[PDB]
Amino acid sequence: GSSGSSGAIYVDLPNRQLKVKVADRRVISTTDAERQAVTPPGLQEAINDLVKKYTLARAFVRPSGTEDIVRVYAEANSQESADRLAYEVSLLVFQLAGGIGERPQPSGPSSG
Prior knowledge:
Substrate binds at residues 62-66, 71. It is a single chain. This protein is α+β, with helices and mostly antiparallel strands. 26% of the residues lie in helices and 17% in strands. The protein has a single domain, classed as TATA-Binding Protein. A hairpin with a 7-residue loop joins strand 2 and strand 3 (70-76). The longest helix is centred in the C-terminal third of the chain and has 18 residues, at 79-96.
């Protein structure tokens, strides 16, 4: 007889990504200038506060890059926090960067 084994990862924290098809650039007030502290000045803070107000949470965003759509991502120790934050962030942007298009949908507590 004989036996082997599988070597790989066995744990992948929860995470959630989104995409805000920004209508465009400029125009928006809180969407100009790029000096004095990494911009946008506040977002990082606002979210940060939310990232701190949460349990082991983490949110991020990626502007233009090989595309014309914004990238959103939020994770946490819990799936909910991961979703909540995510959904929120995406929204936070929708307004912050007056993001539009495909809007973020609510996870919705449903299990069976």
